Amino acid sequence: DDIYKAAVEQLTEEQKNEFKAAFDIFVLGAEDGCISTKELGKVMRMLGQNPTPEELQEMIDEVDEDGSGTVDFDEFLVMMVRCMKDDSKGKSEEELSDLFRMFDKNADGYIDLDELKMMLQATGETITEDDIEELMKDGDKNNDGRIDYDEFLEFMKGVE
Amino acid sequence: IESDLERAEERAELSEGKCAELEEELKTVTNNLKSLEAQAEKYSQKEDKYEEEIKVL
Amino acid sequence: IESDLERAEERAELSEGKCAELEEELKTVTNNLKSLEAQAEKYSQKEDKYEEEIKVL
Amino acid sequence: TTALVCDNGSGLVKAGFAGDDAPRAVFPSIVGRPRHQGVMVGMGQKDSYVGDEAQSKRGILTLKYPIEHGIITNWDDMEKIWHHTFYNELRVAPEEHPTLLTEAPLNPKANREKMTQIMFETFNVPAMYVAIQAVLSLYASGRTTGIVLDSGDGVTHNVPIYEGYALPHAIMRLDLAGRDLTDYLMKILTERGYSFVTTAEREIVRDIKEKLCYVALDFENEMATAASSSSLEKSYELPDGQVITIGNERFRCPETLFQPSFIGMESAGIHETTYNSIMKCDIDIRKDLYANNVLSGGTTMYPGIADRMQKEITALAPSTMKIKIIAPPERKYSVWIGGSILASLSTFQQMWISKQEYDEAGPSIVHRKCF
Amino acid sequence: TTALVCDNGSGLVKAGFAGDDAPRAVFPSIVGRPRHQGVMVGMGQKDSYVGDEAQSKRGILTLKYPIEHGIITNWDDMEKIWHHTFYNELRVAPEEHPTLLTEAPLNPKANREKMTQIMFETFNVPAMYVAIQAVLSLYASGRTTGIVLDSGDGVTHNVPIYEGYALPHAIMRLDLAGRDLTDYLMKILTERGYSFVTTAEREIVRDIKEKLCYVALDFENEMATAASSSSLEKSYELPDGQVITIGNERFRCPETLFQPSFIGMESAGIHETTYNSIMKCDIDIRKDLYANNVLSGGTTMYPGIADRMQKEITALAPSTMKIKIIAPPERKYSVWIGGSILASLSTFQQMWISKQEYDEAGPSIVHRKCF
Amino acid sequence: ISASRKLQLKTLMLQIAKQEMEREAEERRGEKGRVLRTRCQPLELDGLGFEELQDLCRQLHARVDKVDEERYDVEAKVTKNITEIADLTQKIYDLRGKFKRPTLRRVRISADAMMQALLGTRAKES
Amino acid sequence: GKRQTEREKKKKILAERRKALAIDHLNEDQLREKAKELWQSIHNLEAEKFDLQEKFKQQKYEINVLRNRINDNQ
Ligand SMILES: Nc1ncnc2c1ncn2[C@@H]1O[C@H](COP(=O)(O)OP(=O)(O)O)[C@@H](O)[C@H]1O
Ligand SMILES: Nc1ncnc2c1ncn2[C@@H]1O[C@H](COP(=O)(O)OP(=O)(O)O)[C@@H](O)[C@H]1O
Ligand SMILES: [Ca+2]
Ligand SMILES: [Ca+2]
Ligand SMILES: [Mg+2]
Ligand SMILES: [Mg+2]
């Protein structure tokens, strides 16, 4: 899933052509071009089984930035990688707790913004201050500025 | 809207609790003031009596 | 639910106003009580001096 | 380091670090096991909720105080209460802090020895000291003489002190206190129809007593007035609605203090045991004790008691002496404030019972020079 | 492996694998032998059509429910229903799947013991567990407190729960349910001329009740309005034509729930047995039960019941408490959704009655610790 | 950065933190070994008659008993800490678990697995 | 007997943690052997003690973190 999402985001010819051929096969009644909810359900029914459409609708609108009943590109990628769970949610609880306690040099059970940004500098990866703000706001559940282990895991979801 | 209603309810509850506490505090301090005022009146009377006693003795 | 939420928020606002008024009352009465405590201490000193003079006489 | 000024009490445990103005954590001392069966799985249901947690789940618990009258009747529960107090309400391990417990006068020795043995073996404190609950209340008033009436919730005791020299032959300990007043109020409420029986509803009756009851200046006049007019009937809303109206039960509950014949006790009220405690003292320090009568403890917070007691003592005492009753507004925590002051003194720093001393003489060290 | 969350019920058997949102197969629990003679040879006529097959051939059958009021009165038919449910509606052999049956409160012991004996001897499951039908409905709501009124088709029971601790002394089980409402509707339809007698036509009356009846907000005003205007008369087409018009029978059929004197029952309605069930609880958890009243079961799907019940309880309850009635849209399958959630828990995985345990203690194991 | 890009950013963050933990453990082990070397000091054996060796043995046994009592104390502390952290972890789970029951579906097979079941071996990438 | 249980626990701590010392029957050379064995025993015991201290420190750190997270969530 984690490999597949990244691969299909900027895929070469092969599996994107496979998706296109899947749609070409799906034209037996459903031809909306951009997969809507009704066409998605029609495709799933013509497959040969009667699954609960709740998973289909969660795929089609839940992870979406729009949730309009239609299928986007990265949204379809999330749909494809969502059947299984291969992305290890940003490490494991033991690893995350160890990295947070070494992160919590102040041993206060929370990560202040100052040590947060200092660690971010220590990362050395690509810098994005808007992404820094997004991560902080993910840690702004009670909006106390500091980020506990709960919110730390919250924005560590799917980190591969 | 349900979450909004829950937040409104909890805010109202906190405000009412603080109001009750303030009521209790004001009651106590006002009772203290009343008692002290009565004591002060009695003390003025006692002071006049003591001065009279000083003069006569 | 929407109507109930609106009523709850209005109740919370009213309670906050009441709490502010109670705070004002509490501070005023506290100041008055301190003033009367000082007055009573002066009363006590006067009584002490009068008692001593009575004993001497 | 800093000292832990704990104060077991009976009804409210008050604790905090030495040198402050108010206790850090104040919470009822009750340990309540659940009594029903429990059907939800994985709800995380514990086997005993202690402290202030069991005052919120009291609907399905059976609260039971571990301290009856000063003495401790259930040592396991008391150990649980202490463990909670140290670890969750203060979050300071006891391995690095001296402790200063408090104990009522004239209590059984075994209680005090077991207390020190627990503090030294289980919690493993560096050094602990046990002090009489009235001397601290005298510290807090900033006096050095005076006769202090410390009417707690478990036991009411009356220790006279002069110039720092306590008079051991004049301590009058009486076992009427707030708990008996709660039971008597719960018993006289039945005269209107309200029946409280469960050990959880005792807390509701306690709240009624705290918020409504007051001490009458003159008992017969109040009984006559409440029986003609209706200006006294104050109402109160139970935890579920159904408001109740308390009539002349308001000043009849705390009147038991001055007439212990109401609950069948033989002894004289708190207005006459103070005068008796004074009269046992020497003839030359009675004026100072008359002028410096100190009130403390929770139960002396009834509105209008500092006037009733003064009127009664003035009736008993000779007409020439001046009767003055010291009633500080911080009455409830007076013992703990005094404990903080005592623990903060430099002269007191060598009176602690050091652990090596306990190892050499056993728990009976507390009765020795280190009192 | 996965667990089978079966739910016998009385009127509709709901089953499905643990961990889903809705039961996989829902079908009436009726077993109907043919009653006429039969002349065609080789037609392949069976001796008993069960489940949803007998709702299509009901014209020549005599349908008879094997569960009267929660209890099971005809064990052979119930065994047949279970066999059908396992093999044809789910197609999973029971030799490789744990089962989680459900049972009404206060049912006879012998029923439960026979149920477990059948499941262990005939179908030979690995492990089965029996749960009270109301705790599951409380699971599905995602709460942990609240008093749940589970008005099924067989029996209406009202189990209050607080903080996961069920109160066994406050369960009020009443035997009025959907079946009695069907019979009463079939009895009052005769006032217009329509006579339904056959056990097959009871199904038609049930369909009329489901599609047309509703609970009136105020009974007398509706009775007065339906007797003057004609805005209520809704028509319905029988399985052969000859449409019928239901007048004030619409809200008189489900009114029996709030006035069981209509069908001659003495007890009080579902609006007053909930208040009585609350008042038996302790005085400190009544506010939470008032605020978290939960509805479940099929019969609570009448349009307009969540308002009538709230109005009635608000009339009975003290004016200060807030009365809230939780009526999720997935009411019918609430018990089964809760059953799926409970079977999917890791903490619950060791509560099953393993087969070796049954072999050692006999069928009476169900009353023991493994409840 | 893209969503995947910031996921890789946090991945590098976790890698840096893991390296920091590795060096922390290495320095912990080295410094504790040095500290024990300071305490656990080797002593001479040769050149000593019977009495000196017997006295050394007595001292060693006394120190063994003392440090064994101390080890019991620290082990009891460790056990208490284990119990307390287990209780805190369980409380954390209670506050943020239990009611987290997801949509357990046996019909939404894996996209590769479901596609194979409905088509044979069509799905072979995922 | 719970108080008796803890008292016998600490008594066994004071007694059983001490082991059997036998060095006088061991000749000067065997005495050196016994001294070496006791030396290794005490050094390993102090190693265990230090490891216990460090593990307790880490456990207490995690306890602080979890309790702080609880405070945040409440
Ligand atoms: N404001 C109040 N008015 C009347 N009674 C009170 C008040 N506060 C506390 N009490 C009574 O005093 C008791 C608490 O006494 P306290 O001084 O805490 O006892 P202890 O000496 O054990 O600490 C309570 O049980 C209550 O009955
Ligand atoms: N939509 C509806 N409106 C009114 N009544 C209904 C509706 N659906 C079901 N019922 C009644 O509820 C009964 C089904 O209840 P159910 O919850 O299946 O019982 P059980 O607890 O045995 O499963 C039916 O007999 C029917 O009378
Ligand atoms: Ca969309
Ligand atoms: Ca930090
Ligand atoms: Mg006290
Ligand atoms: Mg049911």
Side-chain angles (χ1 to χ4, degrees), chain E residues 2 18-20 24 341 344-347, chain F residues 93 98-99 101-107:
Chain E
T2 43
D20 326 345
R24 188 173 306 278
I341 285 183
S344 173
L345 282 191
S346 52
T347 314
Chain F
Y93 165 62
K98 297 170 170 49
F99 25 92
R101 223 76 282 106
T103 148
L104 309 179
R105 288 86 63 85
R106 317 287 81 81
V107 286

Tab-separated table of all heavy atoms in Angstrom, chain E residues 2 18-20 24 341 344-347, chain F residues 93 98-99 101-107:
chain	number	residue	atom	x	y	z
E	2	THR	N	-13.531	-16.362	12.841
E	2	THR	CA	-14.562	-15.375	13.111
E	2	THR	C	-15.679	-16.012	13.920
E	2	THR	O	-15.892	-17.225	13.870
E	2	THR	CB	-15.135	-14.794	11.816
E	2	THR	OG1	-15.337	-15.848	10.868
E	2	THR	CG2	-14.196	-13.761	11.236
E	18	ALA	N	-19.230	-11.760	13.036
E	18	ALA	CA	-18.852	-10.679	13.932
E	18	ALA	C	-17.956	-9.687	13.207
E	18	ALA	O	-17.050	-10.079	12.476
E	18	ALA	CB	-18.146	-11.235	15.159
E	19	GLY	N	-18.212	-8.396	13.410
E	19	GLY	CA	-17.322	-7.377	12.903
E	19	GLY	C	-17.867	-6.584	11.738
E	19	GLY	O	-17.155	-5.754	11.166
E	20	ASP	N	-19.117	-6.817	11.378
E	20	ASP	CA	-19.749	-6.112	10.277
E	20	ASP	C	-20.691	-5.052	10.824
E	20	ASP	O	-20.751	-4.807	12.032
E	20	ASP	CB	-20.499	-7.079	9.365
E	20	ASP	CG	-19.814	-8.419	9.261
E	20	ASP	OD1	-18.634	-8.511	9.644
E	20	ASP	OD2	-20.459	-9.387	8.801
E	24	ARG	N	-26.208	-10.481	8.231
E	24	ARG	CA	-26.119	-10.968	6.858
E	24	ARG	C	-27.463	-11.470	6.355
E	24	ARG	O	-27.836	-11.210	5.204
E	24	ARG	CB	-25.071	-12.070	6.755
E	24	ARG	CG	-24.792	-12.491	5.331
E	24	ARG	CD	-23.637	-13.465	5.254
E	24	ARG	NE	-22.444	-12.948	5.910
E	24	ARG	CZ	-21.591	-12.099	5.352
E	24	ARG	NH1	-21.798	-11.665	4.118
E	24	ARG	NH2	-20.530	-11.678	6.027
E	341	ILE	N	-20.109	-5.934	18.035
E	341	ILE	CA	-19.055	-5.183	18.715
E	341	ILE	C	-18.507	-5.979	19.886
E	341	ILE	O	-17.294	-6.081	20.072
E	341	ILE	CB	-19.581	-3.814	19.162
E	341	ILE	CG1	-19.695	-2.880	17.963
E	341	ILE	CG2	-18.677	-3.229	20.214
E	341	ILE	CD1	-20.139	-1.492	18.314
E	344	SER	N	-16.334	-8.802	18.813
E	344	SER	CA	-15.083	-8.376	18.209
E	344	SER	C	-14.055	-7.880	19.214
E	344	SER	O	-12.937	-7.547	18.812
E	344	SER	CB	-15.345	-7.274	17.184
E	344	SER	OG	-14.123	-6.743	16.707
E	345	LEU	N	-14.389	-7.814	20.499
E	345	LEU	CA	-13.465	-7.286	21.490
E	345	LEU	C	-12.406	-8.310	21.861
E	345	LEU	O	-12.672	-9.512	21.935
E	345	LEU	CB	-14.206	-6.862	22.754
E	345	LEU	CG	-14.941	-5.533	22.683
E	345	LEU	CD1	-15.392	-5.127	24.066
E	345	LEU	CD2	-14.040	-4.481	22.078
E	346	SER	N	-11.199	-7.818	22.119
E	346	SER	CA	-10.120	-8.684	22.576
E	346	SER	C	-10.272	-9.063	24.040
E	346	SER	O	-9.950	-10.193	24.416
E	346	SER	CB	-8.778	-7.995	22.353
E	346	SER	OG	-8.793	-6.699	22.919
E	347	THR	N	-10.754	-8.142	24.876
E	347	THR	CA	-10.913	-8.432	26.298
E	347	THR	C	-11.937	-9.526	26.537
E	347	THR	O	-11.850	-10.251	27.535
E	347	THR	CB	-11.330	-7.164	27.039
E	347	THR	OG1	-10.515	-6.067	26.613
E	347	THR	CG2	-11.175	-7.349	28.535
F	93	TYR	N	-5.308	3.357	27.269
F	93	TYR	CA	-6.099	2.531	26.368
F	93	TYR	C	-7.590	2.700	26.626
F	93	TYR	O	-8.384	2.785	25.685
F	93	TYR	CB	-5.680	1.070	26.517
F	93	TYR	CG	-6.652	0.094	25.913
F	93	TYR	CD1	-6.925	0.110	24.551
F	93	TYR	CD2	-7.292	-0.851	26.699
F	93	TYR	CE1	-7.814	-0.783	23.994
F	93	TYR	CE2	-8.181	-1.750	26.152
F	93	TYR	CZ	-8.440	-1.713	24.799
F	93	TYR	OH	-9.326	-2.608	24.247
F	98	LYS	N	-11.332	0.762	23.178
F	98	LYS	CA	-12.605	0.112	23.478
F	98	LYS	C	-13.695	0.523	22.497
F	98	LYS	O	-14.084	-0.256	21.621
F	98	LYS	CB	-13.042	0.430	24.910
F	98	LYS	CG	-12.096	-0.086	25.975
F	98	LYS	CD	-12.461	0.463	27.343
F	98	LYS	CE	-11.673	-0.237	28.433
F	98	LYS	NZ	-10.221	-0.290	28.110
F	99	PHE	N	-14.189	1.748	22.640
F	99	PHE	CA	-15.226	2.291	21.775
F	99	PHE	C	-14.730	2.577	20.364
F	99	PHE	O	-15.458	3.186	19.576
F	99	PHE	CB	-15.808	3.565	22.398
F	99	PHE	CG	-14.868	4.266	23.341
F	99	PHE	CD1	-14.024	5.265	22.886
F	99	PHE	CD2	-14.834	3.932	24.687
F	99	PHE	CE1	-13.163	5.912	23.752
F	99	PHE	CE2	-13.972	4.573	25.555
F	99	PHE	CZ	-13.137	5.565	25.087
F	101	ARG	N	-14.376	0.563	17.907
F	101	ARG	CA	-14.677	-0.599	17.086
F	101	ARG	C	-14.896	-0.190	15.634
F	101	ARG	O	-15.783	0.632	15.355
F	101	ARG	CB	-15.900	-1.328	17.623
F	101	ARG	CG	-15.754	-2.842	17.636
F	101	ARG	CD	-14.862	-3.332	18.778
F	101	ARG	NE	-13.435	-3.167	18.518
F	101	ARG	CZ	-12.669	-2.249	19.093
F	101	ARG	NH1	-13.158	-1.391	19.972
F	101	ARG	NH2	-11.380	-2.186	18.772
F	102	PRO	N	-14.128	-0.727	14.695
F	102	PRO	CA	-14.254	-0.308	13.300
F	102	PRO	C	-15.264	-1.150	12.535
F	102	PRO	O	-15.839	-2.112	13.045
F	102	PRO	CB	-12.841	-0.522	12.751
F	102	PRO	CG	-12.341	-1.695	13.531
F	102	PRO	CD	-12.981	-1.629	14.900
F	103	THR	N	-15.462	-0.761	11.280
F	103	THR	CA	-16.377	-1.451	10.375
F	103	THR	C	-15.720	-2.747	9.922
F	103	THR	O	-15.002	-2.781	8.921
F	103	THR	CB	-16.725	-0.557	9.190
F	103	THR	OG1	-16.941	-1.362	8.027
F	103	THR	CG2	-15.598	0.422	8.915
F	104	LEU	N	-15.971	-3.821	10.663
F	104	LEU	CA	-15.406	-5.126	10.345
F	104	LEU	C	-16.208	-5.745	9.208
F	104	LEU	O	-17.335	-6.206	9.414
F	104	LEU	CB	-15.426	-6.020	11.580
F	104	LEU	CG	-14.820	-5.382	12.826
F	104	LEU	CD1	-14.897	-6.335	14.003
F	104	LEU	CD2	-13.387	-4.972	12.554
F	105	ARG	N	-15.631	-5.763	8.013
F	105	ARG	CA	-16.310	-6.250	6.822
F	105	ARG	C	-15.561	-7.443	6.249
F	105	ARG	O	-14.339	-7.392	6.078
F	105	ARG	CB	-16.417	-5.165	5.769
F	105	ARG	CG	-17.444	-4.122	6.197
F	105	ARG	CD	-16.772	-3.084	7.091
F	105	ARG	NE	-15.720	-2.350	6.353
F	105	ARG	CZ	-15.975	-1.287	5.596
F	105	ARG	NH1	-17.206	-0.806	5.448
F	105	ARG	NH2	-14.953	-0.702	4.977
F	106	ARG	N	-16.297	-8.509	5.960
F	106	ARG	CA	-15.744	-9.699	5.331
F	106	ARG	C	-16.043	-9.766	3.842
F	106	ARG	O	-15.724	-10.773	3.203
F	106	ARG	CB	-16.283	-10.950	6.024
F	106	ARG	CG	-16.315	-10.856	7.543
F	106	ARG	CD	-14.925	-10.952	8.158
F	106	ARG	NE	-14.193	-9.692	8.114
F	106	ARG	CZ	-14.359	-8.700	8.978
F	106	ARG	NH1	-15.257	-8.772	9.946
F	106	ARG	NH2	-13.607	-7.608	8.865
F	107	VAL	N	-16.652	-8.726	3.279
F	107	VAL	CA	-16.964	-8.679	1.853
F	107	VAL	C	-16.091	-7.695	1.095
F	107	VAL	O	-15.990	-7.806	-0.138
F	107	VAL	CB	-18.451	-8.351	1.612
F	107	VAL	CG1	-19.315	-9.555	1.943
F	107	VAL	CG2	-18.862	-7.149	2.446
